């Protein structure tokens, strides 16, 4: 679409995800059951990647 979108919707209001407790990010999806910052509610592993994208952020965060 077309620039000028920010007066139309009172959005963000009520989320579409919530505060995790495996990482505390605001991505534990209440309409599924999946964490998209580290995996939880569908998973017993943390995400395992050699990108690094996550692994690096996490180490610095830790």
């Amino acid at each position: 679409m077309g620039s000028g979108t920010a007066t139309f919707g009172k959005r963000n209001s009520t989320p579409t995800h919530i505060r995790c407790r495996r990482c505390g990010r605001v991505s534990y999806n209440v309409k599924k059951g999946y964490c998209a910052a580290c995996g939880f509610g569908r998973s017993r592993r943390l995400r395992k990647y050699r990108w690094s994208k996550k692994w690096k952020k996490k180490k610095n965060a830790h």
Binding site: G24, R25, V26
Partner: protein, 51 residues
């Protein structure tokens, strides 16, 4: 309501409440020159705030 604050979230909010205080006097004497007040002071109109 506002909906809604579970038991742990009142604790978090409470941590957040503490930070919005200026640094007390006794610290600055103890350091012996000086510690500036330093941004963790909270507003309520201007504060939108990821979790």
């Amino acid at each position: 309501m506002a909906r809604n604050k579970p038991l742990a979230k009142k604790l978090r909010l409470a941590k957040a409440l503490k930070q919005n205080r200026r640094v007390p006097v006794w610290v600055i004497v103890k350091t012996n020159r000086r510690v500036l007040t330093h941004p963790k002071r909270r507003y309520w109109r201007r504060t939108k705030l990821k979790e």
